[PDB]
Design an enzyme around this catalytic site. Structure first.
Site, PDB file in Angstrom:
ATOM      1  N   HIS A   1       0.804  -1.231   0.000  1.00 59.43           N
ATOM      2  CA  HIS A   1       0.000   0.000   0.000  1.00 59.43           C
ATOM      3  C   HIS A   1       0.838   1.282   0.000  1.00 59.43           C
ATOM      4  O   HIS A   1       0.308   2.348  -0.336  1.00 59.43           O
ATOM      5  CB  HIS A   1      -0.925   0.051   1.224  1.00 59.43           C
ATOM      6  CG  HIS A   1      -1.991  -0.995   1.223  1.00 59.43           C
ATOM      7  ND1 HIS A   1      -2.803  -1.230   0.131  1.00 59.43           N
ATOM      8  CD2 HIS A   1      -2.403  -1.847   2.189  1.00 59.43           C
ATOM      9  CE1 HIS A   1      -3.661  -2.192   0.422  1.00 59.43           C
ATOM     10  NE2 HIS A   1      -3.446  -2.578   1.666  1.00 59.43           N
TER      11      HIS A   1
ATOM     12  N   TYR B   1      -3.956 -11.119   9.991  1.00 63.31           N
ATOM     13  CA  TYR B   1      -4.098 -10.596  11.344  1.00 63.31           C
ATOM     14  C   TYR B   1      -4.473 -11.667  12.355  1.00 63.31           C
ATOM     15  O   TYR B   1      -4.596 -11.366  13.548  1.00 63.31           O
ATOM     16  CB  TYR B   1      -5.103  -9.427  11.289  1.00 63.31           C
ATOM     17  CG  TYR B   1      -4.554  -8.447  10.270  1.00 63.31           C
ATOM     18  CD1 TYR B   1      -3.537  -7.568  10.631  1.00 63.31           C
ATOM     19  CD2 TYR B   1      -4.940  -8.496   8.931  1.00 63.31           C
ATOM     20  CE1 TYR B   1      -2.962  -6.724   9.710  1.00 63.31           C
ATOM     21  CE2 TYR B   1      -4.363  -7.648   7.993  1.00 63.31           C
ATOM     22  CZ  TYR B   1      -3.381  -6.763   8.397  1.00 63.31           C
ATOM     23  OH  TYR B   1      -2.801  -5.898   7.507  1.00 63.31           O
TER      24      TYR B   1
HETATM   25  O1  LIG Z   1      -3.946  -5.910   5.366  1.00 64.82           O
HETATM   26  C1  LIG Z   1      -3.984  -4.742   4.987  1.00 64.82           C
HETATM   27  N1  LIG Z   1      -3.492  -4.372   3.811  1.00 64.82           N
HETATM   28  O2  LIG Z   1      -3.031  -5.350   2.931  1.00 64.82           O
HETATM   29  C2  LIG Z   1      -4.637  -3.676   5.816  1.00 64.82           C
HETATM   30  C3  LIG Z   1      -4.821  -2.399   5.295  1.00 64.82           C
HETATM   31  C4  LIG Z   1      -5.614  -1.480   5.961  1.00 64.82           C
HETATM   32  C5  LIG Z   1      -6.211  -1.827   7.158  1.00 64.82           C
HETATM   33 CL1  LIG Z   1      -7.285  -0.697   7.916  1.00 64.82          CL
HETATM   34  C6  LIG Z   1      -5.977  -3.065   7.752  1.00 64.82           C
HETATM   35  N2  LIG Z   1      -6.624  -3.387   8.978  1.00 64.82           N
HETATM   36  C7  LIG Z   1      -6.346  -4.478   9.726  1.00 64.82           C
HETATM   37  O3  LIG Z   1      -5.242  -5.002   9.733  1.00 64.82           O
HETATM   38  C8  LIG Z   1      -7.424  -5.000  10.619  1.00 64.82           C
HETATM   39  C9  LIG Z   1      -8.781  -4.929  10.334  1.00 64.82           C
HETATM   40  C10 LIG Z   1      -9.695  -5.617  11.114  1.00 64.82           C
HETATM   41  C11 LIG Z   1      -9.270  -6.359  12.195  1.00 64.82           C
HETATM   42  C12 LIG Z   1      -7.931  -6.408  12.507  1.00 64.82           C
HETATM   43  C13 LIG Z   1      -7.010  -5.733  11.729  1.00 64.82           C
HETATM   44  C14 LIG Z   1      -5.187  -3.987   7.058  1.00 64.82           C
HETATM   45 ZN   LIG Z   2      -4.719  -6.968   3.321  1.00 59.29          ZN
END
Ligand SMILES: O=C(NO)c1ccc(Cl)c(NC(=O)c2ccccc2)c1
Ligand SMILES: [Zn+2]
Ligand SMILES: [K+]
Ligand SMILES: [K+]
Length: 399
Positions: free
Chosen positions: A141, A313
Site C-alpha cells: 500500500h 491478522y
Molecule cells: O492488510 C492490509 N493491507 O493489505 C490492511 C490495510 C488497511 C487496514 Cl485498515 C488493515 N486493517 C487491519 O489489519 C485489521 C482490520 C480488522 C481487524 C484487525 C485488523 C489492514
Molecule cells: Zn490486506
C-alpha cells in the site's frame, strides 16, 4: 533451489511493530518446527555501504522528503518529548499518522522489508534461486510520498524495479484481501510490469480502488501502460473453489500472453475464513486452499518467482498458511515430496496453536463471468497495444 529471507537482526526488526507483533517469529518458527529450513537457502537481507547508497536505493521509488520524514519519525519516537505542532503537520503531510503511526523502530522496521525483498530479487537475478520467499515483505500500500495501510516503504515496488532493470517483463500477482494500490500506481504507466490484484471491494472498504471508478468503467493503466493494470474485485463470502475458478483462467492467460521474465506474488493471508476481517472464506487445506492452488499454478510456469507476505491478522493461522505455501514451493521447485504432519510439532510457540494444535485452520466450510469477459478483452487490448504474438483461441478456451 528455494531461498527464504531471514536473519537474527531481520527477525528482531520484523517483530518490532505494534500492529504485526511477533507474527514473523511464529511464521519462521513453524517453518522451522516442520523441518523445512534445511531444504531452503537462507537469503540474507541487503545491507548498504553508506547512508547515501541506502537513500539511493529507497528513493528509486520514494521521494527523499518522505524518507527523511520517516527517519525523523523514528528519531522523534525514540525520545520522550511529545511531537511539536510543526512536526505533527510535517507527518500529516506524508500520512504518517492514524493507521500508520510512529513507533521507536518504525524506520528500521520498514527498511528491513526493503532489505529483504531487494536481496530476494538479487538472488533471482543472479540465478542463485529459482524462487525466493520473504515472509517479512509484501507491503503493497505504500506510495512514493505516503504511508498507507501500515505500509511505510513499498518493498514490492523496489524489488520489481530491480527485476525489470535487469526485454524484461514482470507479472505481479496480489492475492491479499486488499487491493494492491501502491504497486498498481507505481507501474501505472509501465507496460513491462503487468499488475493483477484479486481482492474484496465494496463501499467504504479499504483502500477503495481496484473496482469500478465513479456506466462507470475500470481504469487499467495510462500512456504506454494502458491496459497493463488488471483487477478482479470479489463479493464477500467467497470460498476456496469459487475464488480458485475466478482467478485460475486469469493467471494462465496472463502468463501465456505476457510471457513474464519474473513473477512476483504477494500472498497476504487476510483472505482466510479465520482472519479477523471475516470477509473471504479461504483456507489452508491441502487434500483445496485457494492460496495453494494459485501458488502451485504460478510455480508450474517455471518462471523465477518472488513470494512475499502481506496482510494477515490471525497470526497462528497466517503461520499455518505460509508454512504450507513454503512446503509447496519446495515440492514444486525441487520435485521432492514434503510430508507435513497434520499436528503442529512442539516448538517455541506451540501454545499459540491451541486449543486443538492442528495445521488445518479451525473452520467448517454471473458476476465473475462478466469480469472474465472484461479482463479477456483488456488482455487482448494489452497485447494489441504492445504487439505481442499470441493465440486468441487458446486464451479464450481457458475460460
Ligand atoms: O492488510 C492490509 N493491507 O493489505 C490492511 C490495510 C488497511 C487496514 Cl485498515 C488493515 N486493517 C487491519 O489489519 C485489521 C482490520 C480488522 C481487524 C484487525 C485488523 C489492514
Ligand atoms: Zn490486506
Ligand atoms: K489483492
Ligand atoms: K502496469
Amino acid at each position: 533451489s528455494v531461498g527464504i529471507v531471514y536473519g537474527d537482526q531481520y527477525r528482531q526488526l520484523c517483530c518490532s511493530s505494534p500492529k504485526f507483533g511477533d507474527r514473523y517469529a511464529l511464521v519462521m518458527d513453524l517453518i522451522n518446527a516442520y523441518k523445512l529450513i534445511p531444504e531452503l537457502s537462507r537469503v540474507p537481507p541487503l545491507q548498504w555501504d553508506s547512508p547515501s547508497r541506502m537513500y539511493e536505493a529507497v528513493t528509486a521509488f520514494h521521494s527523499t522528503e518522505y524518507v527523511d520524514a520517516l527517519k525523523k519519525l523514528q528519531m522523534l519516537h525514540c525520545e520522550e518529548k511529545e511531537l511539536t505542532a510543526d512536526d505533527e503537520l510535517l507527518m500529516d503531510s506524508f500520512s504518517l499518522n492514524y493507521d500508520c503511526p510512529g513507533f521507536p523502530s518504525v524506520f528500521d522496521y520498514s527498511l528491513a522489508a526493503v532489505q529483504g525483498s531487494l536481496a530476494a530479487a538479487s538472488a533471482l537475478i543472479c540465478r542463485h534461486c529459482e524462487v525466493v520467499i520473504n515472509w517479512g515483505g509484501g507491503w503493497h500500500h505504500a506510495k512514493r510520498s505516503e504511508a498507507s495501510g501500515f505500509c511505510y516503504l513499498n518493498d514490492i515496488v523496489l524489488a520489481i524495479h530491480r527485476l525489470v532493470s535487469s526485454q524484461t517483463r514482470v507479472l505481479y500477482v496480489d492475492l491479499d484481501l486488499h487491493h494492491g494500490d501502491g504497486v498498481e500506481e507505481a507501474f501505472w504507466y509501465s507496460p513491462r510490469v503487468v499488475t493483477f490484484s484479486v481482492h474484496h471491494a465494496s463501499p467504504g472498504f479499504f483502500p477503495g480502488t481496484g473496482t469500478w471508478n465513479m456506466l462507470p468503467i475500470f481504469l487499467n493503466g495510462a500512456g504506454r501502460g494502458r491496459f497493463s493494470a488488471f483487477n478482479l474485485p470479489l463479493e464477500e463470502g467467497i470460498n476456496d473453489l469459487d475464488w480458485s475458478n475466478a482467478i485460475g483462467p486469469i493467471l494462465d492467460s496472463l502468463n501465456i500472453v505476457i510471457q513474464p521474465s519474473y513473477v512476483v506474488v504477494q500472498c497476504g493471508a487476510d483472505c482466510l475464513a479465520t482472519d479477523p476481517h471475516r470477509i473471504f472464506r479461504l483456507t489452508n487445506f491441502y487434500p483445496l486452499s485457494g492460496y495453494l492452488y494459485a501458488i502451485k499454478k504460478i510455480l508450474s510456469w517455471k518462471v523465477p518467482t518472488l513470494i512475499l507476505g502481506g496482510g494477515g491478522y490471525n497470526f497462528p493461522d497466517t503461520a499455518r498458511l505460509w508454512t504450507r505455501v513454503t512446503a509447496l514451493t519446495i515440492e514444486e521447485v525441487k520435485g521432492k515430496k514434503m510430508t507435513i504432519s497434520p499436528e503442529i510439532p512442539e516448538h517455541s510457540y506451540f501454545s499459540r496453536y491451541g486449543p486443538d494444535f492442528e495445521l488445518d485452520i479451525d473452520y467448517f466450510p454471473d458476476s465473475i463471468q462478466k469480469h472474465h469477459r472484461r479482463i479477456l478483452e483488456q488482455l487482448r487490448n494489452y497485447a494489441d497495444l504492445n504487439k505481442l504474438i499470441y493465440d486468441y483461441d487458446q486464451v479464450y478456451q481457458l475460460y
